[PDB]
Scaffold this active site. Structure first.
Site, PDB file in Angstrom:
ATOM      1  N   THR A 192     165.395  64.245 -37.457  1.00 47.11           N
ATOM      2  CA  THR A 192     165.949  65.245 -38.357  1.00 47.11           C
ATOM      3  C   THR A 192     167.027  64.728 -39.261  1.00 47.11           C
ATOM      4  O   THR A 192     166.902  64.837 -40.498  1.00 47.11           O
ATOM      5  CB  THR A 192     166.446  66.461 -37.545  1.00 47.11           C
ATOM      6  OG1 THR A 192     165.284  66.972 -36.930  1.00 47.11           O
ATOM      7  CG2 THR A 192     167.043  67.516 -38.430  1.00 47.11           C
ATOM      8  N   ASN A 200     169.445  60.291 -34.782  1.00 49.80           N
ATOM      9  CA  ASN A 200     170.190  61.474 -34.369  1.00 49.80           C
ATOM     10  C   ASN A 200     171.363  61.112 -33.442  1.00 49.80           C
ATOM     11  O   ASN A 200     172.326  61.848 -33.376  1.00 49.80           O
ATOM     12  CB  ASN A 200     169.235  62.470 -33.707  1.00 49.80           C
ATOM     13  CG  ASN A 200     168.365  63.246 -34.708  1.00 49.80           C
ATOM     14  OD1 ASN A 200     168.619  63.330 -35.920  1.00 49.80           O
ATOM     15  ND2 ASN A 200     167.310  63.833 -34.165  1.00 49.80           N
ATOM     16  N   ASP A 241     160.251  73.317 -35.787  1.00 49.07           N
ATOM     17  CA  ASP A 241     160.616  72.201 -34.856  1.00 49.07           C
ATOM     18  C   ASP A 241     160.979  72.744 -33.445  1.00 49.07           C
ATOM     19  O   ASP A 241     160.518  72.221 -32.398  1.00 49.07           O
ATOM     20  CB  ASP A 241     161.803  71.390 -35.436  1.00 49.07           C
ATOM     21  CG  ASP A 241     162.251  70.277 -34.543  1.00 49.07           C
ATOM     22  OD1 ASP A 241     161.668  69.214 -34.653  1.00 49.07           O
ATOM     23  OD2 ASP A 241     163.213  70.445 -33.775  1.00 49.07           O
ATOM     24  N   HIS A 261     158.736  71.523 -30.154  1.00 47.05           N
ATOM     25  CA  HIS A 261     159.125  70.693 -29.007  1.00 47.05           C
ATOM     26  C   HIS A 261     158.640  71.374 -27.703  1.00 47.05           C
ATOM     27  O   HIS A 261     158.228  70.670 -26.784  1.00 47.05           O
ATOM     28  CB  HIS A 261     160.628  70.492 -28.931  1.00 47.05           C
ATOM     29  CG  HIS A 261     161.140  69.473 -29.913  1.00 47.05           C
ATOM     30  ND1 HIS A 261     160.970  68.118 -29.734  1.00 47.05           N
ATOM     31  CD2 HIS A 261     161.810  69.621 -31.079  1.00 47.05           C
ATOM     32  CE1 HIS A 261     161.508  67.470 -30.756  1.00 47.05           C
ATOM     33  NE2 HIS A 261     162.029  68.359 -31.582  1.00 47.05           N
ATOM     34  N   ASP A 290     161.168  67.863 -43.071  1.00 56.47           N
ATOM     35  CA  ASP A 290     161.804  66.590 -42.766  1.00 56.47           C
ATOM     36  C   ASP A 290     160.839  65.611 -42.049  1.00 56.47           C
ATOM     37  O   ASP A 290     160.992  64.400 -42.216  1.00 56.47           O
ATOM     38  CB  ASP A 290     163.098  66.789 -41.977  1.00 56.47           C
ATOM     39  CG  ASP A 290     162.927  67.606 -40.709  1.00 56.47           C
ATOM     40  OD1 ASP A 290     161.831  68.086 -40.452  1.00 56.47           O
ATOM     41  OD2 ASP A 290     163.980  67.745 -40.034  1.00 56.47           O
ATOM     42  N   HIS A 291     159.920  66.142 -41.214  1.00 57.12           N
ATOM     43  CA  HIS A 291     158.982  65.266 -40.425  1.00 57.12           C
ATOM     44  C   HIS A 291     158.019  66.219 -39.765  1.00 57.12           C
ATOM     45  O   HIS A 291     158.243  67.424 -39.785  1.00 57.12           O
ATOM     46  CB  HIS A 291     159.722  64.460 -39.325  1.00 57.12           C
ATOM     47  CG  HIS A 291     160.590  65.308 -38.465  1.00 57.12           C
ATOM     48  ND1 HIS A 291     160.078  66.220 -37.552  1.00 57.12           N
ATOM     49  CD2 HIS A 291     161.946  65.454 -38.432  1.00 57.12           C
ATOM     50  CE1 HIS A 291     161.083  66.902 -37.015  1.00 57.12           C
ATOM     51  NE2 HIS A 291     162.216  66.440 -37.519  1.00 57.12           N
ATOM     52  N   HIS A 317     158.821  63.918 -32.047  1.00 60.01           N
ATOM     53  CA  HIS A 317     158.636  63.195 -33.299  1.00 60.01           C
ATOM     54  C   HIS A 317     159.663  62.051 -33.288  1.00 60.01           C
ATOM     55  O   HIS A 317     160.566  62.004 -32.422  1.00 60.01           O
ATOM     56  CB  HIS A 317     158.849  64.167 -34.477  1.00 60.01           C
ATOM     57  CG  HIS A 317     160.169  64.873 -34.390  1.00 60.01           C
ATOM     58  ND1 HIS A 317     161.346  64.322 -34.869  1.00 60.01           N
ATOM     59  CD2 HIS A 317     160.508  66.038 -33.792  1.00 60.01           C
ATOM     60  CE1 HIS A 317     162.356  65.139 -34.592  1.00 60.01           C
ATOM     61  NE2 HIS A 317     161.871  66.199 -33.951  1.00 60.01           N
ATOM     62  N   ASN A 322     168.681  37.485 -44.417  1.00 57.68           N
ATOM     63  CA  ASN A 322     169.712  38.476 -44.002  1.00 57.68           C
ATOM     64  C   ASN A 322     169.120  39.905 -43.874  1.00 57.68           C
ATOM     65  O   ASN A 322     169.861  40.905 -43.762  1.00 57.68           O
ATOM     66  CB  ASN A 322     170.914  38.439 -44.948  1.00 57.68           C
ATOM     67  CG  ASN A 322     170.555  38.784 -46.374  1.00 57.68           C
ATOM     68  OD1 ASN A 322     169.391  39.035 -46.714  1.00 57.68           O
ATOM     69  ND2 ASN A 322     171.563  38.855 -47.221  1.00 57.68           N
ATOM     70  N   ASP A 324     168.010  42.291 -45.656  1.00 59.63           N
ATOM     71  CA  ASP A 324     168.538  43.414 -46.467  1.00 59.63           C
ATOM     72  C   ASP A 324     167.466  43.995 -47.394  1.00 59.63           C
ATOM     73  O   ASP A 324     167.767  44.856 -48.227  1.00 59.63           O
ATOM     74  CB  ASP A 324     169.802  43.054 -47.234  1.00 59.63           C
ATOM     75  CG  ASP A 324     169.619  41.955 -48.271  1.00 59.63           C
ATOM     76  OD1 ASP A 324     168.525  41.384 -48.476  1.00 59.63           O
ATOM     77  OD2 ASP A 324     170.629  41.690 -48.984  1.00 59.63           O
TER      78      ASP A 324
END
Ligand SMILES: *[C@@H]1O[C@H](CO)[C@@H](O[C@@H]2O[C@H](CO)[C@@H](O[C@@H]3O[C@H](CO[C@H]4O[C@H](CO)[C@@H](O)[C@H](O[C@H]5O[C@H](CO)[C@@H](O)[C@H](O)[C@@H]5O[C@H]5O[C@H](CO)[C@@H](O)[C@H](O)[C@@H]5O)[C@@H]4O)[C@@H](O)[C@H](O[C@H]4O[C@H](CO)[C@@H](O)[C@H](O)[C@@H]4O[C@H]4O[C@H](CO)[C@@H](O)[C@H](O)[C@@H]4O)[C@@H]3O)[C@H](O)[C@H]2NC(C)=O)[C@H](O)[C@H]1NC(C)=O
Ligand SMILES: O=C(Cn1cnc2ccc(N3CCN(C(=O)C4CCCC4)CC3)cc2c1=O)NCc1ccc(Cl)c(Cl)c1
Ligand SMILES: [Ca+2]
Ligand SMILES: [Ca+2]
Ligand code: NA
Ligand code: NA
Ligand SMILES: [Zn+2]
EC number: 3.1.4.39
Length: 804
Positions: free
Chosen positions: A159, A180, A261, A265, A308-309, A419, A684, A686
């Site tokens: 989330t 999270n 969500d 769950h 969000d997902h 998730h 590195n 990045d």
């Protein structure tokens, strides 16, 4: 300490939070336990519920009521959302036929169409079809507006990382909300969803859209909500704010729902219990739209409905336990669940060793449902390494599974959904719909990544975006107006075009080749190839532009063109086209160990064979594959020292199979392919091109740098009835960035024939052209017949290899 004995009278849902110890009346006061004493009484009214009824119509205003049905409510901006329907004979928005919104139809005093972002937690993409009969308001948004079949979240598919990516346009590694739950070793502090550390601003990097707006004179509060404020009150608050005077009224608003969500769950993504939460979210969308219709804003505001997902079936019996692999499990800290992150329990424990942990977790059980990585070895498409909050050891968990440290963690902690998995997994995909004057009408757009939306929200509001990881212009096809018209970046380094400048005997590279193999007809022909006569066949979209300062040469050949770096002693890119009819041949016996000096390039700027002989760990490969030469004579060009790159023998297994087998398979399937391949150096981790002084490994005794990865970009015609080299319209692309590793420990079946494991590896390391651009400082597709925004969309495409 809060002096909660101040009052919220005339302050309910104030937009500017006030400073401690003064009591607060804004939408986050509940989270801080800092609301004034009378916040519930004044600001959270519930009397008579949320809907007008026939008997309430024209009532005398009672200030106690949750919402109003008195005649004055329209001018007070505080009617129940169904007021006009119940009392004034109006229709619900959902029952009106869609009509194209060609221009904003806004009340006087509105400077721009407001933007309302309606965020739904855990809203899996397939709900839009599978739940469509129970979500009529959302279905009208979707069908009438602009929608994608799905939107790709960022990794991890949790989330807070995704909502904050939506707000900033940044990858989690860059905005800093990497899970999270997080530990930051510099702060020596921990972040959690529950509790107060997350209120400290030091966790939250980048610049979220409300700050971008505020800095540029566009009014906007934060997008957060206290969980205990009911959704009906959130909607009425938004509608009240939209009724503020012009100088006071925000231009951007956010609604957040913790559903579906929360139920997902408990019940799994498609549990029969899921219907009711989807109905209730649809009802909330209907309240908002009816409310907008009442305010004559329903053809003025742009609405984004975004998740969000997604959500996957996950139950506690599908848990892998690290205590079944590690003898030393009490010496580690694990962040568990649908991803794993491991670090030492104690920084004073000098016997903690990541190499031994990785080895103990690698391919130990036949159907092992997670895979360990050092974070720099994770697929580059995840962009999940460049932050001190991301532990060095990562576990990629299979979909439908969890990982935990010990069994007691799982029963001394019910659930059927979760998730967080790899963001290419179908169950993790989520939703995007845009509806309003600035979006297109009844338009379907291809799937895209949520990192792109910040720029579009900036475009919708007339804001300059802060620097972010979207590719601005790549979502121009979602918009009717306010498109962003980027210019291509300027080339920084122009190439040299060397001719023949060195004699063979000037080279002392320790190389040999049996090429002393014995004509005015065909000699002018070979000269023309070296001058670029086939270049239009093999460089189909222009040469890549080099966007940094360096010294490089363009080298032309019959079968391939390359941009050869005098600094890195190898090509930055090699480009070649393989037609559907191309034939695969072998490396001839007499040419097995052949490497040939390139008389266009100085011995000083060349690799040498002796270094490879001396380096017992390192071998070499070729960028243009000798297997795909156009003729026995052209094949000699493939063995030029300027086509050689360093390759571990384990990696050569992968690379040789790609070149010998898979390129031709693609050309067969796609009607020709153009391939651009090259090295990448990202020591590195990045996500960005290393400079020469960042290189950590060289071929032993030499200045030949070792790539961390090898890329290929494989382009053809979207209309596969036309050959790749004679394509009239849009293009199709797939790319990869393969890690250049000295073993194949990542592939648990690597002892088997490459036909059983190599392509699976390549799929896992699928990439966007834009990912390669960041990693190389090159800019591709500079010379096409296509619009630049279309090319930006193509550069953001990711070929995911998931089913429907
Ligand atoms: C995705 O998009 C983003 C946004 O465009 C891209 O990230 C940018 O990348 C740049 C290069 O890596 C980076 O530029 C550096 O900025 C330094 C100033 O940084 C601060 O100020 C900015 C602007 O306000 C701010 O955004 C930064 O925020 C970061 O840091 C705070 C923590 O303090 C976090 O809260 C925040 O989340 C964010 O963290 C992320 O970025 C940092 C790097 O800045 C990472 O370390 C984190 O892990 C995390 O990912 C900062 O508050 C500036 O000082 C740098 O300049 C040094 O390096 C350059 C190289 O050009 C060199 O020329 C200079 O001389 C200088 O060197 C000196 O310092 C060195 C380091 O100590 C030292 O070794 C030398 O010897 C010298 O003394 C550099 O310009 C920019 O900050 C980030 N921005 C963000 C928001 O992340 C990202 O690349 C994109 N990703 C991809 C794949 O494309
Ligand atoms: O809303 C919630 C839960 N919830 C509830 N009460 C909160 C009270 C305060 C704070 N803090 C304010 C000060 N703060 C900041 O000002 C930083 C963030 C931007 C820069 C500084 C740090 C954060 C966050 C929350 C919060 O998350 N969940 C939904 C949601 C919506 C939008 C986004 Cl973007 C995200 Cl990530 C999550
Ligand atoms: Ca969520
Ligand atoms: Ca780098
Ligand atoms: Na060697
Ligand atoms: Na292996
Ligand atoms: Zn969740």
């Amino acid at each position: 300490w809060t002096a909660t004995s101040g009052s919220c009278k005339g302050r309910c849902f104030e937009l500017q939070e006030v400073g401690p110890p003064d009591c607060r009346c804004d939408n986050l006061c509940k989270s801080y336990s800092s609301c004034c004493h009378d916040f519930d009484e004044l600001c959270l009214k519930t009397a008579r519920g949320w809907e007008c009824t026939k008997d309430r119509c024209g009532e005398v205003r009672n200030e106690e009521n949750a919402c109003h049905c008195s005649e004055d409510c329209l001018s007070r901006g505080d009617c129940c959302t169904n007021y006009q329907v119940v009392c004034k004979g109006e229709s619900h928005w959902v029952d009106d036929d869609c009509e194209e919104i060609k221009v904003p139809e806004c009340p006087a005093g509105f400077v721009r169409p407001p933007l309302i972002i309606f965020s739904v937690d855990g809203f899996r993409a397939s709900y839009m079809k599978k739940g469509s009969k129970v979500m009529p308001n959302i279905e009208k948004l979707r069908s009438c507006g602009t929608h994608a079949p799905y939107m790709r979240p960022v990794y991890p598919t949790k989330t807070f990382p995704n909502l904050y990516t939506l707000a900033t346009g940044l990858y989690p590694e860059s905005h800093g909300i990497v899970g999270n739950s997080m530990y930051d070793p510099v702060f020596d502090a921990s972040f959690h969803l529950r509790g107060r550390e997350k209120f400290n601003h030091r966790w939250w990097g980048g610049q979220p859209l409300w700050i971008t707006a505020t800095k540029q004179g566009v009014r906007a509060g934060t997008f957060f909500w206290s969980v205990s404020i009911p959704h009906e009150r959130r909607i009425l608050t938004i509608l009240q704010w939209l009724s503020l005077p012009d100088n006071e009224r925000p231009s951007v608003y956010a609604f957040y729902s913790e559903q579906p969500d929360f139920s997902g769950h408990k019940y799994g993504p498609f549990g029969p219990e899921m219907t009711n939460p989807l109905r209730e979210i649809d009802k909330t969308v209907g309240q908002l739209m009816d409310g907008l219709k009442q305010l004559r804003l329903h053809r003025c505001v742009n609405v984004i409905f975004v998740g969000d997902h997604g959500m996957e079936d996950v139950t506690c019996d599908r848990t892998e336990f690290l205590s079944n692999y590690l003898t030393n499990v009490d010496d580690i800290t694990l962040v568990p669940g649908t991803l794993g992150r491991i670090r030492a329990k104690s920084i004073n424990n000098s016997k903690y060793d990541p190499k031994t942990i990785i080895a103990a977790l690698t391919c130990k059980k036949p159907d092992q449902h997670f895979k360990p990585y050092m974070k720099q070895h994770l697929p580059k498409r995840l962009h999940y390494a460049n932050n001190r909050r991301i532990e060095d050891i990562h576990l990629l968990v299979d979909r439908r599974w969890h990982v935990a440290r010990k069994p007691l963690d799982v029963y001394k902690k019910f659930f059927q959904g979760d998730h967080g998995f790899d963001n290419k997994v179908n169950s993790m995909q989520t939703v995007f719909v845009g509806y309003g004057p600035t979006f297109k009408y009844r338009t379907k757009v291809p799937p895209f990544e949520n990192i792109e939306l910040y720029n579009v929200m900036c475009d919708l509001l007339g804001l300059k975006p802060a620097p972010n990881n979207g590719t601005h212009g790549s979502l121009n096809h979602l918009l009717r107006t306010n498109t962003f018209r980027p210019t291509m970046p300027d080339e920084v380094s122009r190439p040299n075009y060397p001719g023949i400048m060195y004699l063979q005997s000037e080279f002392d590279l320790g190389c040999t080749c049996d090429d002393k193999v014995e004509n005015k007809l065909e000699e002018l022909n070979k000269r023309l190839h070296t001058k670029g006569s086939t270049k239009e066949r093999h460089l189909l979209y222009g040469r890549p532009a080099v966007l940094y300062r360096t010294s490089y040469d363009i080298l032309y050949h019959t079968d391939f063109e390359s941009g050869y770096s005098e600094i890195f002693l190898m090509p930055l890119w090699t480009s070649y086209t393989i037609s559907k009819q191309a034939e695969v041949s072998s490396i001839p016996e007499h040419l097995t160990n052949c490497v040939r000096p390139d008389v266009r390039v100085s011995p000083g700027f060349s690799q040498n064979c002796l270094a490879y002989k001396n380096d017992k760990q390192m071998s070499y490969g070729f960028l243009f594959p000798p297997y795909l030469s156009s003729s026995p004579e052209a094949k000699y060009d493939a063995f030029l020292v300027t086509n050689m790159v360093p390759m571990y023998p384990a990696f050569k297994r992968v690379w040789a199979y790609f070149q010998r087998v898979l390129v031709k398979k693609y050309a067969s399937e796609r009607n020709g392919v153009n391939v651009i391949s090259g090295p990448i150096f990202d020591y590195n981790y990045d996500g960005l091109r290393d400079t020469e002084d960042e290189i950590k490994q060289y071929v032993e005794g030499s200045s030949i740098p070792v790539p961390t990865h090898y890329y290929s970009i494989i382009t053809s015609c979207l209309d596969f009835t036309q050959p790749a080299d004679k394509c009239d319209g849009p293009l199709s692309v797939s790319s990869f960035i393969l890690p250049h590793r000295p073993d194949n420990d990542e592939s648990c079946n690597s002892s088997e024939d490459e036909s059983k494991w190599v392509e699976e590896l390549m799929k896992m390391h699928t990439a966007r052209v834009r990912d390669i651009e960041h990693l190389t400082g090159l800019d591709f597709y500079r010379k096409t017949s296509r619009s630049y925004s279309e090319i930006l969309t193509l550069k953001t495409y990711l070929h995911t290899y998931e089913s429907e």
